Design a protein around this nucleic acid. Sequence first.
RNA 1: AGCACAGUCUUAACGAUGGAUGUCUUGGUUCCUACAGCGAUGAAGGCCGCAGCAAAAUGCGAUACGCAAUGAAAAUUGCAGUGACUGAAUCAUCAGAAUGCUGAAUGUAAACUACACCAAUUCCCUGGGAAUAGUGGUACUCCUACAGAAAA
Length: 101
Amino acid sequence: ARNPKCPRIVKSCHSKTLDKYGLIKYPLTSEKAMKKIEEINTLVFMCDKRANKKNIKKSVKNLFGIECDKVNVLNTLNGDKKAYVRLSGEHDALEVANKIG
RNA sequence: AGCACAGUCUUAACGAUGGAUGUCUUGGUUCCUACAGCGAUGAAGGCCGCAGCAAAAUGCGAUACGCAAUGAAAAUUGCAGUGACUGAAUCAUCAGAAUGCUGAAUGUAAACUACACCAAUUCCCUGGGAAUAGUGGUACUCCUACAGAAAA
Ligand SMILES: [Mg+2]
Ligand SMILES: [Mg+2]
Ligand SMILES: [Mg+2]
Ligand SMILES: [Mg+2]
Ligand SMILES: [Mg+2]
Ligand SMILES: [Mg+2]
Ligand SMILES: [Mg+2]
Ligand SMILES: [Mg+2]
Ligand SMILES: [Mg+2]
């Protein structure tokens, strides 16, 4: 195995990878997204292209205290991802929507 | 209220169409003078992004029409905003910090954001306390050391 006298390259700056901010941008408030809130218990978010399904689940949980059981994804033509997030039964989508806007 | 035949051709006066002429020039062209390469510490070129409202060109790189520092030094604007009674609003300089995916492109591939193996990795206080599937390495040829094994 390698036993260098010293590493070739050493970084010392703050991390450059995407964290929870920059991985979720903002909720989408179109007239199709407002309908999902009441009769489907679903919220819609716009996300960075490089996000996974698991990434979005974790980031939404850490940002808004949201428990979810299903995420669906689609890449749009403006360079963004759209996420349809089903909220678990204990959560009511209306109160979560009111808590943030 | 009345009087000129119509067409065709000629000449004056006033207009239409068109963009010559004259004047202008932050642009070309030639000559003279000085200096001179960049790259595995990742170049030239290509793609993708960045502004409160933002298409092109110009400028920048997840700190993204700009940060820090140094010299000047009150304004900058379409609206909204931001600034002193001078590290602040703006201009210049530019040495610190930062610098996406690629490309000789170098783990294996490529009208794929496809697939491997090895080491888990990165922070904060001063041995604790946290976070994260995230980070780095692995082409070919060659030189100097070294390591053991093999033949003789
Ligand atoms: Mg699909
Ligand atoms: Mg006649
Ligand atoms: Mg040379
Ligand atoms: Mg590029
Ligand atoms: Mg000072
Ligand atoms: Mg100053
Ligand atoms: Mg490769
Ligand atoms: Mg194929
Ligand atoms: Mg060869």
